[PDB]
Design a protein around this nucleic acid. Structure first.
Ligand SMILES: [Mn+2]
Ligand SMILES: [Mn+2]
Ligand SMILES: [Mn+2]
Ligand SMILES: [Mn+2]
Ligand SMILES: [Mn+2]
Ligand SMILES: [Mn+2]
Ligand SMILES: [Mn+2]
Ligand SMILES: [Mn+2]
Ligand SMILES: [Mn+2]
Ligand SMILES: [Mn+2]
Ligand SMILES: [Mn+2]
Ligand SMILES: [Mn+2]
Ligand SMILES: [Mn+2]
Ligand SMILES: [Mn+2]
Lengths: 94, 82, 99, 105, 99, 87, 106, 97
DNA sequence: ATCAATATCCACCTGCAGATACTACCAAAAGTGTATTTGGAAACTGCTCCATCAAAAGGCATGTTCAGCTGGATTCCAGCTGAACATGCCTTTTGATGGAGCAGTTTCCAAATACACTTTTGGTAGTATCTGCAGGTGGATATTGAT
DNA sequence: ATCAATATCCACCTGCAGATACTACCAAAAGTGTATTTGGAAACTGCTCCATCAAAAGGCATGTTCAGCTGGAATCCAGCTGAACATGCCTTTTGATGGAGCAGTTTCCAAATACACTTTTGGTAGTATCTGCAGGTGGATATTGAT
């Protein structure tokens, strides 16, 4: 028997942070997993093309950023860029 | 009684679909037109799904086979893995 | 006189009813029957995961509902309230699903 | 030993995102910043949906988020709807909407 | 006594004329100004390869031509021969450009 | 040392005869008077979206010059693939 | 004397280049030897198919040189190539002559 | 300084052109189109094969991945003939050395 | 306007399918540390091509007049489709039951990678010279529209 | 039908931009050969979950009647939009110049890969307790449609 990875427990953690007294059905969790996987693929794919276009062999935080700008609508992209910049800063200092 | 399978997709079920689509009044010829459209959709998706099955050397069409096929046809479906 | 609603009244009632709910609207077994028949033309003696058939029905029903919305807009564009094959065809043509 | 997620202030798993990146054949190399940034963006997007879907549950007088609530949240949000325009949510149904010309009187 | 073609005759002649040819139908320099104006509002001090502007114009014209095709079908659906703003809007809605 | 004149109102450089010609190639026989402003609006949205993406590619490459490839890549990801200028 | 892998496969299209582009493109960790051969064959076949029909289009228009218009005519008039290239724009290709019947005078 | 070499499929497209229409030429703009076509189809097939290999936890793209990708991507007769020409080329290639 | 017939809503209740909280088990995965390699930022700069210039000119945009015929409003009515009700047919449930085949594990070799060295080639680059056909004219044929 | 105004056709021709032709060069590509590693096919198999089966239960699909009202056909007409004309402007074209910035080449270290080792974690499996809410009830009341 083998194990199957999922984002479930990470989705759940994020849920309790925004709505501490709110639960989520397993069907709805399946949807969230599909969501996280889809956006991952979209962003990774775009970052991949960016690197190739510029003859780069490395995907860095810079590629992830341009990819996010290309893929997310205005305000969603603004906050996402800020959240991403924040996490990389705190990761540098820590 | 002898019965074709696409004819198993009944008029009242097609009506309910139209209702959820916000349709108030339906022409008599719609039900056969719909079944034809339904068939092409299923054929296109199942073809690609089975193609994934064969490649994996399986005899069982999995939900993932379908999900991948749906993504190919630009009909991305959330909730069934992937 | 026995009670009778005007034509269109019950239809509007059904629209509100089904736009409120999320349950599938095609019978399961007849749909399962159709899928297996179509698959048979591509490869013989196939089996299906139950979740595979369900994925198909969800995708197929969601597709038809969306198509009916576009079809409705086409009928209304022609100042009708009755959808016709004419309307489905126009929608599919503009969608790029044909012609 | 402190995990990279903790080090980044994130709930989403940085190590896993990094592993998925290099095994996905997206490039030859992966900078250390990329899985942090990407994990952050994914966590933020998850939060935004869960927030809006949570509200949808509240409005429907439920405490448990189901598919329907996710659909209501996404299709009622202009940007989320655009982002997920070519996506069908299983068991989501549609928004209540009736063309004016179809209404009586 | 001065010659006049009936309304519609010259329009049909023009359809045949431009469906036969492949040249760009928007004037080159005005289109270039539009491109620079729009790009400038997004980022200052940009320069353009000449082929970049032409790539944009080839795409824009092919887009509009295709849109007018669908628009035409929408007007004909409404039993008109004259395209109107509501035809363009319908085509773009079904296309998923506004939906 | 010196700056270029201000660019404004250039959408009107897309004239009524130019729009009529495009409609003809699209098989249109008769055109209402309000089509021309509607078309300009639709064209501007299309152009803004393509240029925004193209310029985003430009900046990522740290260039000041928008290349044909920038445009082609932008068109590609907008689902409007273009042959004849590219890779 | 060396043999090119293309001649070894009986192909005009370059097997060596296709293999190189496959590895450089980050599609998978490993690329088998039959993969670039098969792919080069498919690409060559598709090229032949289009050039055949475009050459006919050129001939139909009393031209000996294929130009983009001929490529567009050949593609849009073939149901299957039209489908494969349904989201593609051919620069300087124009459109098919097509006037909706209802627009004609009676 | 030498400008770096810009590879294209031109001399191959041209060869196939002469096989198919010996007395027909092709303009550079038309050749430009053909180059875009080959690159596009290349990326499509390669991308589909990439996904395919990943869905099946394989680290190798073989001719079998390419074949399934061609069946998924190409319509009807085009798939039929492409598969045949591909199978033919591989069997021939392996029958040597 | 009244008033009867249904649909619809709200408050409350209860059984249970699905959510949860627990403890334990472990392979994989993530963190740590060290040694090695290398991608791509810097610096320098050659040289392509972009911006801007001028100037002449005619292709084409603008603006107006005119009225043909299209779109929009109105009326009318045959008939199609919605509502309702009466049957009765087969979808649904669920529960058990072989067993097909998915998937896990072990073995192992054909084929892939890494690498060093040799040869072949496709891509400029610099000129040099054909050639298909764009665009011009002229005159014969075809189309359109008035009568 | 006759005819006249005008577009359309097509043959003919000439200029030339762009295609074809050659040599020379060469850096990268491609091929060969040897050695070393390993992905995944093959064979066997356990356990999941799929197909089938019975078997009521009844919910829901089907057939029929009647008529409300919608779609489509016909008629009219104001005025929008097409055709043609006069006017002249601004795009197009052709060519030049400076220099911005793209891009080619080389040096070099910060960061990434590659192992080996240790520790943590997420997926897991039973096992038991819990609970949000679907579904049923009744009665209030809103809606619809008859007068
Ligand atoms: Mn501005
Ligand atoms: Mn280096
Ligand atoms: Mn009048
Ligand atoms: Mn009319
Ligand atoms: Mn067995
Ligand atoms: Mn050579
Ligand atoms: Mn000519
Ligand atoms: Mn192994
Ligand atoms: Mn009647
Ligand atoms: Mn009506
Ligand atoms: Mn003027
Ligand atoms: Mn400089
Ligand atoms: Mn744990
Ligand atoms: Mn309830």
């Amino acid at each position: 028997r083998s194990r199957k990875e999922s984002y479930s427990i990470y989705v759940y953690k994020v849920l309790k942070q925004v709505h501490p007294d709110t639960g989520i059905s397993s069907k709805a969790m399946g949807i969230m997993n599909s969501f996280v996987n889809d956006i991952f693929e979209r962003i990774a794919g775009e970052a991949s093309r960016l690197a190739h276009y510029n003859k780069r062999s490395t995907i860095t935080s810079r590629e992830i950023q341009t990819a996010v700008r290309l893929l997310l609508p205005g305000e969603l992209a603004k906050h996402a860029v800020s959240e991403g910049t924040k996490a990389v800063t705190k990761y540098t200092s820590a | 009684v002898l019965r074709d399978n696409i004819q198993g997709i009944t008029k009242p079920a097609i009506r309910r679909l139209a209702r959820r689509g916000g349709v108030k009044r339906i022409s008599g010829l719609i039900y056969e037109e719909t079944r034809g459209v339904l068939k092409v959709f299923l054929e296109n998706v199942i073809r690609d799904a089975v193609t994934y099955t064969e490649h994996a050397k399986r005899k069982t069409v999995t939900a993932m086979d379908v999900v991948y096929a749906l993504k190919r046809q630009g009909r991305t479906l959330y909730g069934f893995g992937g | 006189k026995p009670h009778r609603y005007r034509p269109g009244t019950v239809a509007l009632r059904e629209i509100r009813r089904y736009q409120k709910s999320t349950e599938l609207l095609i019978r399961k077994l007849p749909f399962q029957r159709l899928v297996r028949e179509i698959a048979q033309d591509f490869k013989t003696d196939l089996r299906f995961q139950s979740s595979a058939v369900m994925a198909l029905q969800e995708a197929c029903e969601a597709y038809l509902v969306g198509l009916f919305e576009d079809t409705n807009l086409c009928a209304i564009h022609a100042k009708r309230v009755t959808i016709m094959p004419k309307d489905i065809q126009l929608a599919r043509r503009i969608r790029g699903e044909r012609a | 030993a402190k995990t990279r997620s903790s080090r980044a202030g994130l709930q989403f798993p940085v190590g896993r995102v990094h592993r998925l990146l290099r095994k996905g054949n997206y490039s030859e190399r992966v900078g250390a910043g990329a899985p942090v940034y990407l994990a952050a963006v994914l966590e933020y997007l998850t939060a935004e949906i869960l927030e809006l879907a949570g509200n949808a549950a509240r409005d429907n007088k439920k405490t448990r988020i189901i598919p329907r609530h996710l659909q209501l949240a996404i299709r009622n949000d202009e940007e989320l709807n655009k982002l997920l325009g070519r996506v069908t949510i299983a068991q989501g149904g549609v928004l209540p909407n009736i063309q004016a010309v179809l209404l009586p009187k």
